[PDB]
């Protein structure tokens, strides 16, 4: 909340609640939050016209294009999502996996 206050005037409208939304990600240092909120500002400032601003949707999109400074150098990948039901036949294994990993 402080960074959304600090560098430039801004408002998330209650279209999303302000608390909790942070848990859309977690691996972030405070330094990560600074640059991330700058990315938010510039991205929607680019994709929207140069008028007043709101972060809904574009936040959830743009967060796809980032990783924390601790990770960005180390190898990481994300697949073309083979969603749960796509492999979903004989779900027994996927259910064991989701159960034991989601705890």
């Amino acid at each position: 909340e402080y960074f959304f206050s600090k560098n430039q005037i801004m408002k998330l409208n209650r279209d999303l609640q302000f608390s909790d939304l942070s848990l859309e990600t977690e691996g972030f240092s405070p330094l990560d939050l600074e640059i991330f909120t700058e990315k938010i500002f510039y991205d929607l400032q680019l994709e929207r016209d140069c008028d007043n601003v709101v972060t809904r949707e574009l936040f959830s999109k743009s967060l796809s294009a980032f990783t924390p400074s601790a990770l960005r150098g180390v190898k990481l990948t994300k697949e073309t999502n083979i969603k749960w039901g796509d492999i979903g036949a004989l779900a027994n294994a996927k259910d064991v996996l989701l159960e034991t990993l989601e705890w």
């Binding site: 990948t77 697949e79 073309t80 083979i82």
Partner: protein
């Protein structure tokens, strides 16, 4: 790009990174390009026919399958 049969195998232990990894990823590094193989029946023995003397055929075959298959997010024309 190509390798001529057992162009891969090499003196030291840990053969795979000395060749097959570097070349096969080089084909991903190149623009759309084939890899040609000949005499695969010499390069990838059926793993169940287990070999003595360091079993290196298991090392090649494992690394080759791992670098080859699955190819998720990786359809870069590597025929």
């Amino acid at each position: 790009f190509s390798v001529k049969g057992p162009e891969l195998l090499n003196m030291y232990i840990g053969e795979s990174e000395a060749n097959v990894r570097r070349v096969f990823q080089k084909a991903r590094e190149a623009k759309p390009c084939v890899i040609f193989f000949d005499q695969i029946d010499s390069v990838a023995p059926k793993r169940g026919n287990q070999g003595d003397s360091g079993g290196v055929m298991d090392r090649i075959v494992s690394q080759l399958l791992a670098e080859l298959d699955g190819m998720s997010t990786d359809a870069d024309g590597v025929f």
